[PDB]
Amino acid sequence: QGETHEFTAEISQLMSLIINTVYSNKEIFLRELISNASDALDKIRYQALSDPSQLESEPELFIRIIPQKDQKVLEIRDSGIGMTKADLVNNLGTIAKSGTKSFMEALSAGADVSMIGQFGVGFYSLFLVADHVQVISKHNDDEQYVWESNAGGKFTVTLDETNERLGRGTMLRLFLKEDQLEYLEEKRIKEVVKKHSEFVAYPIQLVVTKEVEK
């Protein structure tokens, strides 16, 4: 049962600018997505200070980076607060009109793309390196859902009957552009994390797949 919705026009505008830009420091996407993961983790930690049972759906607080080399997919998972079905539609497809408009005006004046997070729309920096995204999310109030976008004017939201259970939190699945496959490599990911994400209150875990040889 796929629900199709329309992006706020300005968000569609910004996605087109980002997916097409030749900006040369694309690695900042990972900084922005780790920062958003950290924010989501802050929110569940805040709720858990009042009500520790909110953590029972996934007791550990983490950010986890999972390259899927054969799929040409980079996954970025957190155990933050998650998004309900109603959220995903709102947080990603509709709200942040203000930040997107302000950021585009800043771009026209000369702003560096790397300041995208100062406008609150750093999520959309993922289109620097990906041409398609799935956002899998699980909030304590709700079932697990998948939100999906190709940087065009529409997105879908579907009950998640095909991905691993998250317990609680959000996983972005970035379908990388053909010239951006360096962000599947352990050494490259580590470099970017260490350079840009030193001040993060949660462990940043890197999942690496190695052949056992003798």
Numbering used by the authors: 5 to 218
Please share text taken word for word from the publication where this structure appeared.
We obtained structures for the domain under three conditions: apo (unliganded), in complex with ADP, and in complex with the prototypical inhibitor radicicol. Despite the presence of different ligands, overlay of the three crystal structures showed an almost identical conformation for this domain with a root mean square deviation (r.m.s.d.) of 1.32 Å or less over all atoms. Nonetheless, localized structural differences between the apo and liganded complexes were observed in the loop between α-helices 4 and 5 (residues Gly97 to Thr104), a region on the edge of the ATP binding site. Overall comparison between both human apo structures (open and closed) and the fungal N-terminal domain showed no major differences, with main-chain atom r.m.s.d. of 1.02 and 1.15 Å, respectively. Importantly, however, the region spanning residues Asp91 to Gly97 of C. albicans NBD in its apo state was seen in two conformations. We hypothesized that this observation might result from greater flexibility within the fungal ATP-binding site than was immediately obvious, an increased flexibility that might contribute to observed differences in the intrinsic ATPase activity of the fungal and host homologs.
Hsp90 is essential in all eukaryotes where it regulates the form and function of diverse client proteins, many of which are key signal transducers. Hsp90 enables drug resistance via multiple molecular mechanisms, most notably through the stabilization of the stress-activated protein phosphatase calcineurin and multiple components of Pkc1 mitogen-activated protein kinase (MAPK) cell wall integrity pathway. Hsp90 also serves as the previously enigmatic thermal sensor that controls temperature-dependent morphogenetic switching in C. albicans, a key factor contributing to the organism’s virulence. To identify potentially exploitable differences in the Hsp90 expressed by a fungal pathogen vs humans, we determined the crystal structure of the C. albicans Hsp90 N-terminal domain, which includes the nucleotide-binding pocket targeted by all Hsp90 inhibitors in clinical development.
